[PDB]
Every structure is written in C-alpha cells, then in structure tokens.
C-alpha cells in the first residue's frame, strides 16, 4: 500500500542517483505547505496511517536487496525488510510503536531491536563517529549486504550500525539537503569514498533548529542566528532563509505559518 521507490548501487551514476533523490522527496513533501520557497515535511497531528510511510528498496550489485522503512513527516528511517525477516528500531514513542505495526505486515519474523535509531546512539555501537564513516556508492553497496546478512549471523552489530549511518544519511539526509545530495553525487561522479566534512555534519545536527528558525522567522529574518560549519571546519553564521534555499530541500513540520499582512 504504501508507496516504493528503488534505487541500486550497481552502475549507479550522478544521474541515477539524483533521479532516486528527486523521487524520495516526491513521496515525502505533497505540495501543500512551501515556506520561503522550502516545503515542508507533513505534519504527524492528524496524518492518516495509510500516508504515514514510505519504501525505499535499495539493490546492490551482489543482487541482494532490503527495503527501508521511512516516516514522512521526517524521513526518520524506522526500520528494514531483508527477505523473511524485519527489523525496527526500538521507538521513541507510542505513537511511533502503533505506526511500525502497519510496516511489512506479510514478513515471516518481527523485530525490534532494544536501542533507538539516533546518530548518538548508531555511532557507540558502530564504535566510530559519523566523522569517520567513509560514504559514497562503495560503502552504500556494501552497508545494503551487511543489512541483508545480519539475520544470518553474518554481520557484526557494529557493521550493521555503521551501515545504517551510511543509508540514513545518502538517503534521508540528502532528501533533506541538496548541499548533502550534492556531496553524494560528487562521491558518485568520481566513484571515491570519503568520511563526510563538517560542513555535511554540521547541517545533519541543526536540520531541527534550522526548520524552527525558518518557521519562526520575522519574514524570513532569524531571531537568534545559527553557527554552522564550512568544509575546513570555520564558522559560517545564518541569519536568513534566504542564503538556505539552495542547501535545504526539505524541513521538518515545527509550527503553523503565520498570515501574510495587507500592505
Ligand atoms: N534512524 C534514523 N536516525 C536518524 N538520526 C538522526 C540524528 O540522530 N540526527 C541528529 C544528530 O545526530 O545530531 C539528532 C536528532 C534528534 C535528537 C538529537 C540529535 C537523523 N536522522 C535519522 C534518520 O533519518 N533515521
Ligand atoms: N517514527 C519515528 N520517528 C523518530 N523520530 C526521532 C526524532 O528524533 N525525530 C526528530 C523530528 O521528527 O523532529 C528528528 C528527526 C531527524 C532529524 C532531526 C530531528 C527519533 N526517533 C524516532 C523513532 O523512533 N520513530
């Protein structure tokens, strides 16, 4: 029922690569809510079960595939499908536990796993930072077998964390960002693996409070300015949606928008 986009990191191309991203977000932002040309994300009060998830089944060139489980209203991935078995990180609310029960309804073994699905909580058992983790179209096809194997035995819990810290963020993390899309295609193009820069890292940590500032703002105008980070690690300050348009795609639902004034 609920809607599957796909994407494989055999012969994957910039090309290839940007049409899956473009495609994520289609099913992730309807059109209704566009704030200082940024759409929004759904809001989670009142949104239909059968409108709360989407699917992005991930093939590789070893021809294995899993499909991940993600929320509209974040892109938060919640989950996986690897054949007979599903996997769901340990939920941060009620809610959230009642909406997993709606994914992968038809597979053989359920499981939640007895930790959350947050950076801080995937790096200590990944036993490395996000800082450290090497992305690109290599690690991607690699972290889609690791997901694959771990029913079986053959994946280490510290390889399975890491791989899902390379999904989260070539996936949902791009779909936020096109400056973090862009860093991907760049891995892509030039088929070269590196550990994201502080300026990637910097933008996954504030996405919440830049959403908030965005939809709080005096007519697109901060309150308060926001400390983000270049690729050399120097400080780049916002005080604007306005230098944001070209590096965020999508926000996360913070508050109402405010009616515009009659002049
Ligand atoms: N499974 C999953 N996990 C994710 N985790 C993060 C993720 O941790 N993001 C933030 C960070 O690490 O700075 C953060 C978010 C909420 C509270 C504190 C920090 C961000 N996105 C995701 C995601 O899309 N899927
Ligand atoms: N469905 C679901 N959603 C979850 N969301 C979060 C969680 O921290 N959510 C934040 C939010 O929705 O604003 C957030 C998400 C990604 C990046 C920054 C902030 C944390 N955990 C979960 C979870 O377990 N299940």
């Given at each position: 029922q609920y809607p599957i986009i796909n994407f494989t990191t055999?012969?994957?191309?910039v090309q290839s690569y940007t049409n899956f991203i473009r495609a994520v977000r289609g099913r992730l932002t309807t059109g209704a809510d566009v704030r200082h040309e940024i759409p929004v994300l759904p809001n989670?009060?009142?949104?239909?079960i059968n409108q709360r998830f989407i699917l992005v089944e991930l093939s590789n060139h070893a021809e294995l595939s899993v499909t991940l489980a993600l929320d509209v209203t974040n892109a938060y991935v919640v989950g996986y499908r690897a054949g007979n078995s599903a996997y769901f990180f340990h939920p941060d609310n009620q809610e959230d536990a009642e909406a997993i029960?709606?994914?992968?309804?038809?597979?053989?073994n359920r499981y939640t796993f007895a930790?959350?699905?947050?950076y801080d909580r995937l790096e200590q058992l990944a036993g490395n930072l996000r800082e450290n983790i090497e992305l690109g179209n290599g690690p991607l096809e690699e972290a889609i077998s690791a997901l694959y194997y771990y029913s079986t035995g053959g994946t280490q819990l510290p390889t399975l964390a890491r791989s899902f810290i390379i999904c989260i963020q070539m996936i949902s993390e791009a779909a936020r960002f096109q400056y973090i899309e862009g860093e991907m295609r760049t891995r892509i193009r030039y088929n070269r693996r590196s550990a994201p820069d502080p300026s990637v890292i910097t933008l996954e940590n504030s996405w919440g409070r830049l959403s908030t500032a965005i939809q709080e703002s005096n007519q697109g105008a901060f309150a308060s300015p926001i400390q983000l980070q270049r690729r050399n690690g120097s400080k780049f300050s916002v005080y604007d949606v306005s230098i944001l348009i070209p590096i965020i795609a999508l926000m996360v639902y913070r508050c109402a928008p405010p009616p515009s004034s009659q002049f």
């Open positions: 055999a012969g994957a191309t989670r009060v009142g949104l239909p029960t709606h994914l992968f309804t038809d597979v053989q930790f959350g699905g947050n």
